[PDB]
């Protein structure tokens, strides 16, 4: 036979030039300030996988099925994508925008640490943001609900000083 070969984690469109899909994806890319299409596609694949797990477990029965069902629900609401009282059916109503709201770049922007999405990306990449006492430099990292409030400037960063000229401009917004 053949040994294992590592495979891509995302899927490409079936047809590269469809006008409606191009327009929709362009709107998303502009709004969330992503670097290239593949990054976007990555998140899409994640969404699809969740749905494909929900569809398979609805039509199943037995002992392992219940365990996997509760594990899926717990994982989904640990990420902050579902409320605490959601049921399995609610999985089938998630959208691509729901996942994009959990990116570290977006959350840094929404919390008011930056004036713009691009500034948030630069702040993350250069190492000015700490999450739960740890510095992370990946703008696409998905933030868990339990750690969302412990996101601040790094304690060694120049921005961790309210008199810094650039921070005062950020606070002005």
């Amino acid at each position: 036979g053949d040994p294992k070969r590592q495979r891509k984690k995302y899927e490409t469109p079936p047809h590269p030039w469809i006008k409606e899909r191009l327009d929709r994806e362009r709107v998303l890319m502009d709004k969330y300030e992503l670097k290239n299409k593949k990054e976007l596609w990555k998140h899409e694949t994640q969404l699809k996988n969740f749905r494909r797990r929900a569809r398979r477990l609805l039509a199943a029965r037995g002992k392992q099925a219940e365990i996997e069902r509760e594990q899926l629900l717990a994982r989904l609401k640990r990420l902050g994508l579902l409320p605490e009282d959601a049921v399995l059916d609610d999985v089938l109503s998630l959208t691509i925008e729901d996942i994009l709201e959990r990116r570290l770049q977006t959350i840094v922007y929404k919390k008011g640490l930056a004036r713009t999405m691009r500034q948030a990306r630069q702040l993350i990449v250069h190492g000015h943001i700490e999450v739960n006492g740890q510095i992370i430099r990946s703008p696409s990292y998905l933030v868990l609900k339990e750690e969302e409030d412990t996101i601040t400037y790094a304690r060694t960063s120049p921005f961790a000083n309210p008199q810094h000229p650039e921070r005062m401009m950020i606070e002005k917004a």
Partner: protein
């Protein structure tokens, strides 16, 4: 820097004690072996001649480092058990 002892374990079969510790040091470089050894022998009343520092490791975006060291009750036992290279690296003996 602040040194915090995580665990101390006794090994009667070898004749040594094994020490795990953390060093907290925001805005500072990774501590040197000499400083850590001095701090440890001050903190636990150890003979510096029979104390070896196995390693000091830093991490990606952390303000702290993790260290592992060993302390022997007899110098001859330490010479008989430990590899030669680790003794040279810690300055206990002299390379030829």
């Amino acid at each position: 820097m602040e040194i915090k002892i995580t665990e101390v374990k006794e090994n009667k079969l070898i004749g040594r004690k094994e020490i795990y510790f953390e060093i907290y040091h925001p805005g500072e470089p990774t501590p040197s072996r000499k400083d850590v050894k001095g701090k440890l022998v001050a903190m636990l009343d150890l003979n510096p001649e029979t104390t070896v520092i196995q390693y000091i490791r830093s991490y990606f975006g952390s303000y702290k480092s993790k260290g592992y060291a060993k302390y022997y009750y007899d110098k001859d036992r330490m010479l008989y058990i430990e590899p030669e290279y680790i003794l040279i690296r810690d300055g206990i003996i002299e390379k030829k």
